[PDB]
Amino acid sequence: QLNSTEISELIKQRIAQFNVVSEAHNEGTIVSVSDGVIRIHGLADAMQGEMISLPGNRYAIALNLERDSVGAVVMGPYADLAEGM
Amino acid sequence: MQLNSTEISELIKQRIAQFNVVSEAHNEGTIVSVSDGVIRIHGLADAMQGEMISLPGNRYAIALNLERDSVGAVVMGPYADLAEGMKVKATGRILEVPVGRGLLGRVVNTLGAPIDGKGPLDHDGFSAVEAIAPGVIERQSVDQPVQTGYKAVDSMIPIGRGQRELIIGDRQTGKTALAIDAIINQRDSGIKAIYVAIGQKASTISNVVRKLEEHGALANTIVVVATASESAALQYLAPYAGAAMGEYFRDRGEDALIIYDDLSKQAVAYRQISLLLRRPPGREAFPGDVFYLHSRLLERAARVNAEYVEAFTKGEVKGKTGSLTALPIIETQAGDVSAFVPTNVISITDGQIFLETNLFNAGIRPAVNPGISVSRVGGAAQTKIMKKLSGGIRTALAQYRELAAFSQFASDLDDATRKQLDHGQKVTELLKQKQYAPMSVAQQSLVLFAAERGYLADVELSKIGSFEAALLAYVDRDHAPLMQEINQTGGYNDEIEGKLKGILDSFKATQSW
Amino acid sequence: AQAEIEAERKRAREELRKQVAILAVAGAEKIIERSVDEAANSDIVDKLVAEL
Amino acid sequence: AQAEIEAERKRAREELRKQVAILAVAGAEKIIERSVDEAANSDIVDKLVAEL
Amino acid sequence: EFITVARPYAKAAFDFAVEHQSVERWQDMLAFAAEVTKNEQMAELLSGALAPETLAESFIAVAGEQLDENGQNLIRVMAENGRLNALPDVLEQFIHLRAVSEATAEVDVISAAALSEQQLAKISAAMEKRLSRKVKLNAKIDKSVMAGVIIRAGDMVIDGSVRGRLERLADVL
Amino acid sequence: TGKIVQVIGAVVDVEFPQDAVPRVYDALEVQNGNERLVLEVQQQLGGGIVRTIAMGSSDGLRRGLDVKDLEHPIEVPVGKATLGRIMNVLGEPVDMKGEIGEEERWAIHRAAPSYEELSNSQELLETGIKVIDLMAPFAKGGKVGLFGGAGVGKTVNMMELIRNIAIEHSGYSVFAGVGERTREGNDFYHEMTDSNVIDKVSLVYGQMNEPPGNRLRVALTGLTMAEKFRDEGRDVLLFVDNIYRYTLAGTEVSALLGRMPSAVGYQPTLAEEMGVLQERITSTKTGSITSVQAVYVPADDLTDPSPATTFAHLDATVVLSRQIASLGIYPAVDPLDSTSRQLDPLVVGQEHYDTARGVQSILQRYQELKDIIAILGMDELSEEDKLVVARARKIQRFLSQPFFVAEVFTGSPGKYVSLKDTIRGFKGIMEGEYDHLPEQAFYMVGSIEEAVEKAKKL
Amino acid sequence: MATGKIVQVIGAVVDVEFPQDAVPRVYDALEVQNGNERLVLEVQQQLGGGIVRTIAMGSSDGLRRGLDVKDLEHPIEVPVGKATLGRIMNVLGEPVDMKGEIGEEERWAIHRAAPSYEELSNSQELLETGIKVIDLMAPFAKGGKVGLFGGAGVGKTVNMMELIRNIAIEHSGYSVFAGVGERTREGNDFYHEMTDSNVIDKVSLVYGQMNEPPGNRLRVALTGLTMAEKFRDEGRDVLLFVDNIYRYTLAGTEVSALLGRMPSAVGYQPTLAEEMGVLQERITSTKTGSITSVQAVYVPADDLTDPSPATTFAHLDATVVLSRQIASLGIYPAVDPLDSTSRQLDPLVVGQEHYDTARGVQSILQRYQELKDIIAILGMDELSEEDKLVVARARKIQRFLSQPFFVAEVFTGSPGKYVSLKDTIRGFKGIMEGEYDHLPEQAFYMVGSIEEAVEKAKKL
Ligand SMILES: Nc1ncnc2c1ncn2[C@@H]1O[C@H](COP(=O)(O)OP(=O)(O)OP(=O)(O)O)[C@@H](O)[C@H]1O
Ligand SMILES: Nc1ncnc2c1ncn2[C@@H]1O[C@H](COP(=O)(O)OP(=O)(O)OP(=O)(O)O)[C@@H](O)[C@H]1O
Ligand SMILES: Nc1ncnc2c1ncn2[C@@H]1O[C@H](COP(=O)(O)OP(=O)(O)O)[C@@H](O)[C@H]1O
Ligand SMILES: [Mg+2]
Ligand SMILES: [Mg+2]
Ligand SMILES: [Mg+2]
């Protein structure tokens, strides 16, 4: 038993209004940063091998589309990225 | 005989006068599982990592995983009586052991309870089992001898006071024999001894102690035991408990020699603990931190400069440098040095002595392989006489083995080669030595002088053994003032070379092998 | 031989110490059971709450 | 000597059998804060001779 | 055990209940949700591998005492991660977080015999200064401690039982 | 009171009311169809769940069965009532005879004797066997291990040791069958009854058909009987039919117990599980146990963890080699790997010690030459190197011996060889007194006189 | 104010929960009271909501769940510049020599990006070491990287002490010594050696001994680089010595499992090549200044196949391989000529005179290694008399590459020798031709120049 992107403020949103699909599929937020991999919540319209634009005119490639999140690999320096971007 | 039967009551009754009516406060948890010596505890919000946790009875556990919502801890003893819902109290304490001079001649477990049955301990208080070593600015360079009494080791592979020297080899090659002879020989050197037995069977520790007591060595020695029946936590801690006892002498300005028998059994106990705690297995299934286990242990063996001693003793002891010397033992499975635990310990130590089965079966005992053995302190550890004689020996003997391989089918030898192919056999024969028969410095020096200055050359090889025995016998009756001079001084001069030459000239003429 | 004898004598005294202490507290328990008092019980409570 | 301490223990039993008398200090003089009346004035020797 | 996975859901629900000033209701809703979780027929349904939405809407069916706008959502979030068995633990952490938020503590007192109100006064008044919280005592006097008292708050314990002294003395052996 | 809640192979989980949870190593009991099944408690999980190993077949167990809590460990009969009888791991009688006339039962889980209790002894125990007491002699009250691969001779060797030792010894004996062949249990029992020696021997059998819980704990049933006879003050012989099966039955259950795998997939607890068993097999100031253990070596790999851990436990170790046995030299003892704590000049004395080290030195040097000989042939050797080979080959043959138990294979009659005749024979060969005899003269002859009589007829 | 709390401690790895709007950046430092002692943590990962996974720069012993953690909004910053010289510092840049406060004017973060492609330089000016086998077989250049490869006990340390003696005293410029994962004894002996020879005022030492917690050894090398990069950016020429590069990779392996990564290869962290490359690519000589570096490389069990030594070979310019197979014969320096190599060994730097001499020596030793296999079984008589002659002159060249060091007199008992490059070339030509066909093999062993090998032959 372990947590799978079950984090308090995301849960509180779903409590307030469950149908968050009302927000655009085009965008999302970083929820983890480690070793050059980021996990993103959202991006419902992401696709395999798509370029995701990051702050600082950087990019990541979407490589795992998972049921709750996208795993993407940073094509540059990563160490200044932060969750909630 | 036992008029104290009255007086033990007064001792018992005054305990009541000492005991204290204060209600204390403590942080509390409950056991939620018990398995294989590991317990999980709910609660203990104020538990610290490496803390002693106290259990029902007089039993303790060590807190190792501080996870969210549970503590994982290992029981230092028989665990099987514990149960779910038992109430568990966190002390403030780290693990400490009795320490002092009064430990000498006692057999104690890793917790330091006396198991010899010679009654309670005399001791000089308690010291932490886990402790940081002296830093760079607090050390002094190793430049004093600790004598093994073995011709092979003391000539070729000298050990200095504060060195760490790995004894490594396969099973049944004489690993322990070398280390207990190194203990036995300290009986009059002033160097205190510690023998830590990790994971051995208890009757082996009976036999060793019975040999140390058959000589005068046990009254110089502390014996620390964790037998194969005892829990993995007790075995894992047993080397650290031994080092804490050796550090008492080291911080006073006295010398101690500590033997860790089977550091590899300490690693196996540490692997048991780590897998039972579900920590991820690394290579060869050991945890990754296993290097930090051995390296923090062995860097405690150190020579400290006089300033560090004065500060520790608060000016009671001034001008004296203290030293702790460690002799760890590793077992290889088939000479394979590439295993994870051997490669770590070979990286850490200041050298190694390789003992190997082919030499031991050939009758070369002690089976020291001159080529792959090395001391990283070298000549700075020797007395000047041994330093002068022995430097030539070990590298010459290694090249003799290469030469003997290259020669093995060639019918014609040039006389440099033919001389080399003889001298090396006679030196190989000279370095064999019987167990429990240590030789003083002057006795070793005299026999090495006979080999370096060529006096062996005409003597037929099987007689070389009898030649040595007769030479030691001859010199002890007729020339003992020189033996006293060399043993006390370790000195070497032209008159020393002259007197030794005169002794070899006189022996080889007058006597018979 | 003399070291062996003195050591067994020292063990016998520590053994004898183990014997009395167990049966002493097991007796002192019965002194509570037959000498406890409700004013003394209240004295314990009122003392500790005054120094908690 | 073993045969001496084996005899001397039999002698020692009587001092242990005596000194288990003194248990009031253990129990009452710790736990009752002020000193106590001997409510156990029979049960003290009852404990002595029954327990040892 | 569900204690770690209950934590995120427990916090979310409490903060929301605060911003909506409805904490008492929720605690009632979570209690109801924790009882339907125990029903023997539902405990088979919860164990079998239904799809999350077919399970959730079947769960919502058996509760009509739930605030649908906010309380069905909670159930739907837990169902989407399979978590519904954590509801009895989510409840206990909601109660725990509430008491920290209300700066209030439960305290358990154990003794050989019932206490006087004057002792209960001194105990409570001391513990409020120990904790810097309000306290609410309960007394659970016992057959086996023969004199003295124990005080437990959180997991900190103060012992004055004679039972504890008899063993704590025998320890000096 | 308890309920079964999982069944995974040999492992059964049981839930209890949280006020009543069984202790570790308690016995439980459950009705499985038309028979009673015992379970042994291994671990306390949370929530009153307890995890247990079945002492019997676990098939036909449902979930939801009611389980009965016995308040005590597995306890077995001990004492003279066990003598001459065959017993189960649970200490039930397995011969068709009546109930065991027990007076006392002991729990099979016990602590080892304290360090103060142990006793040293140096009384050499003679064997009939030329290689064993020459190369790896052993004492009364010591431990011997026979190491070998599949089919190399561990059992035939132990059957000569039983014949030689356990019939000139006068006290009681225990034989523990641990995960070995049921045929060989029946064969051994009948030769004991036919010889009327059975009434001195206790037999515990948990052979290889039995499910893992039986194979694991039958070793401890065997020791607990031997510890009763030792504490009574007797001198006892303990024979263990294959110690390796104890460790292997641990491996089989360990994953189901939920323990991460170690090394070559062994249980992480391997060295503790072996160590706590092994430390109980010790002679003591009250009385003595002499022990012989067979040690199977998986895939002939002497560096596997299970053999490797066993080597530190024992006082004499005899290593059997498939490479020698395929020569047909028997016993297939490797003299360059077999060793004993007793091969020491003080206890054996010098003539024995010098002979053993001479044999070891010649046979080592023959290994050093074999890689030359293999490519070039022997003609390239020096005339002294040829003499080492010519002696070493004779020595390897003279190490062979006819066993009395082997007559059903070899046909030729068994020999018993004195220690005086063995050291005299090898010392004579190494002195070269016999360099005029052929190699075949030495093969399978009891004593050196028998070699010269064989040489007359070649 | 302190704004986070410790929520797990497992071994060296500590997890801290911050508010969801003030989460520490990766590689930020954090601070906590471990009783009396202040402890620093370095942030490795952001994971979940508000939680960060960190490595302790010190012992975890005595940490509790619940301790308040301060957020320092910068990475680990260390003192740099002249104030460092003659001082010993730990990984955090704290003085550990008792001499008092460092007295800096500037502090730099230990994490920084490498020089850009436009900034690099190719100024391969040849550098003389005075060691026969190195100057012939593997010539150094100023501003290059040198690796001393070998397993345990083969001579990496005393070779580095010889190189430090010869170039670093002559260099006339500052030096940095990084004691990564070193033995505390040897770090002491080096400090006294530099003090007694009175060159310590030129050199700053960063020490991260083995006993130190895995976090310290993981980062101590970057502290050494950051001091060397300060002197390079000033425009100075500096020498950087690294005690053992392998031990940085090994400290990465220790934490990597606890940081939740899956294992790779021979149980190494998956990031091994990235972690190596990110350290090594800072140690370069730009247009403003040059860093010359000598690195020791531990080779586990002497297996040059192993991923950690195999990966570092690509980053160096000269690589010297020390072999136990040679070291077993006692013939130090134990450099293997058939495996050691340098980027500088080509005619456009070395000139043809040196190039021809080195390629000659390689061809002879290569041939002899095949001949040696025949001899051991068949014997030497089965050779052609020309192959016998090559076996002779090769077996001499093998001994002539040996040289006693005046940092090794304590082991040898004998006086150490220095050789010029000019004299080295002339000596090897002389064995390759006939001039010394008549000397014995032992007349070469640990000699010095060829001009004194004749003298040992007369003594032999
Ligand atoms: N110098 C020696 N000369 C002759 N025999 C020796 C010598 N040293 C040791 N032995 C013998 O070697 C045998 C094994 O020695 P020891 O027990 O020290 O080896 P070990 O490597 O410790 O074995 P283990 O691996 O079981 O611990 C013993 O019989 C001992 O008597
Ligand atoms: N001394 C001997 N003389 C003749 N044959 C022998 C001798 N020792 C062993 N053998 C042969 O080896 C075979 C197997 O030996 P044994 O049955 O003792 O092995 P084992 O210990 O049962 O091996 P495992 O237990 O692995 O099956 C038998 O055929 C036996 O004849
Ligand atoms: N050039 C040399 N001259 C003499 N002895 C040497 C030489 N190189 C190595 N040795 C021997 O090898 C030992 C270990 O080498 P060292 O460099 O100290 O270890 P490492 O190579 O692991 O750093 C030295 O103590 C010495 O005994
Ligand atoms: Mg040993
Ligand atoms: Mg068999
Ligand atoms: Mg080094």
mmCIF file of N, CA and C and ligand atoms in Angstrom, chain B residues 376, chain G residues 156-157 183 186 243-244 296, ligand 6:
data_model
loop_
_atom_site.group_PDB
_atom_site.id
_atom_site.type_symbol
_atom_site.label_atom_id
_atom_site.label_comp_id
_atom_site.label_asym_id
_atom_site.label_seq_id
_atom_site.Cartn_x
_atom_site.Cartn_y
_atom_site.Cartn_z
ATOM 1 N N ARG B 376 51.460 -1.624 3.454
ATOM 2 C CA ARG B 376 51.552 -0.247 2.982
ATOM 3 C C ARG B 376 52.296 0.674 3.939
ATOM 4 N N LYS G 156 49.325 3.355 -6.996
ATOM 5 C CA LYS G 156 48.714 4.607 -7.431
ATOM 6 C C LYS G 156 49.115 5.757 -6.523
ATOM 7 N N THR G 157 49.177 5.514 -5.220
ATOM 8 C CA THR G 157 49.420 6.589 -4.267
ATOM 9 C C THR G 157 50.861 7.081 -4.324
ATOM 10 N N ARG G 183 42.056 7.235 3.059
ATOM 11 C CA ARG G 183 42.440 6.844 4.412
ATOM 12 C C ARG G 183 42.962 8.008 5.240
ATOM 13 N N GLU G 186 46.814 8.462 5.687
ATOM 14 C CA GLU G 186 47.587 8.965 4.554
ATOM 15 C C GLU G 186 47.353 10.447 4.303
ATOM 16 N N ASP G 243 42.280 12.019 -5.076
ATOM 17 C CA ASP G 243 42.737 10.809 -4.398
ATOM 18 C C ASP G 243 42.173 9.535 -4.998
ATOM 19 N N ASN G 244 40.871 9.498 -5.270
ATOM 20 C CA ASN G 244 40.315 8.331 -5.951
ATOM 21 C C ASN G 244 38.957 8.692 -6.515
ATOM 22 N N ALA G 296 43.730 9.300 -9.560
ATOM 23 C CA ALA G 296 43.794 7.865 -9.330
ATOM 24 C C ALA G 296 42.435 7.221 -9.559
HETATM 25 MG MG MG H 6 45.772 4.483 -2.437
#
